């Protein structure tokens, strides 16, 4: 997250931190995700597409820091790793950039809700807030485009939903953005998601409830003028989600 503010897991208790083990045994951060039910975390397919073996991944819930333990955290293996069959990627856009991870502990359990671990509601079908609505994004991604390191402490910021029309302007992304995506940006371009935030939550208040409106997917650079963050539009994937979690 470029700009914004440091936070803790209490302020986004559905946030999932997804890591990969390496042959040799190092573990590195991969992507964020969102707990949508006790056994299911939702994220982005591009986070996994290159290394799609489920045994390689570890998921933590209740985590506020990247490389140290948070009191109350829970660690999970990935029982099922489900990537979207229609995923595709070009120079820029990632299409159908959505993935589901079924989580299970060494003790065979799903998530136990606590002060630091809760689920986030899915939106209702094809129902998204209007452009100019402020929403929040959360992640462990870079604080500056040029940074080599990821921040050790979780961050969040606020960005505004941008119309499809605006986002499809050629100086923006043209037709790379589809109706299955949502654009969001800061009016001054001063805050944004960045590398390492992918898979994490875009959350908007919708009918007075907090709703998983989007999933961090792609963009050109970070906090770059005329180049919004692009998010998978969750309200357009509900059949896929339900069908794959039943």
């Amino acid at each position: 997250i470029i700009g914004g503010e440091f936070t803790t897991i209490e302020n986004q208790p559905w946030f999932a931190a997804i890591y990969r083990r390496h042959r040799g045994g190092s573990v590195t951060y991969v992507c964020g995700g969102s707990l949508i039910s006790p056994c299911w975390v939702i994220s982005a397919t591009h986070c996994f597409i290159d290394y799609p073996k489920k045994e390689d991944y570890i998921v933590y819930l209740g985590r506020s820091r990247l490389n140290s333990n948070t009191q109350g955290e829970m660690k999970f293996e990935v029982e099922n790793l489900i990537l979207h069959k229609d995923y595709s990627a070009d120079t820029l856009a990632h299409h159908n950039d959505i993935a589901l991870l079924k989580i299970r502990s060494k003790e065979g359990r799903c998530a136990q809700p606590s002060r630091t671990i809760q689920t986030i509601a899915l939106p209702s079908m094809y129902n998204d807030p209007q452009f100019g609505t402020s929403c929040e994004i959360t992640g462990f991604g870079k604080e500056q485009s040029t940074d080599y390191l990821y921040p050790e402490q979780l961050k969040m910021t606020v960005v505004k939903l941008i119309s499809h029309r605006e986002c499809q302007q050629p100086h923006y992304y043209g037709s790379e953005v589809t109706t299955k995506m949502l654009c969001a940006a800061d009016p001054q371009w001063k805050t944004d998601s960045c590398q390492g935030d992918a898979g994490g939550p875009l959350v908007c208040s919708l009918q007075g409830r907090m709703t998983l409106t989007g999933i961090v997917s792609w963009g050109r650079g970070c906090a770059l003028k005329d180049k919004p963050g692009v998010y998978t539009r969750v309200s357009h994937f509900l059949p896929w989600i339900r069908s794959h979690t039943k």
Partner: peptide, 12 residues
């Protein structure tokens, strides 16, 4: 390889 889209990518 400093962008959203390229997290956990081999090519990078």
């Amino acid at each position: 390889c400093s962008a959203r889209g390229l997290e956990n990518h081999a090519a990078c």
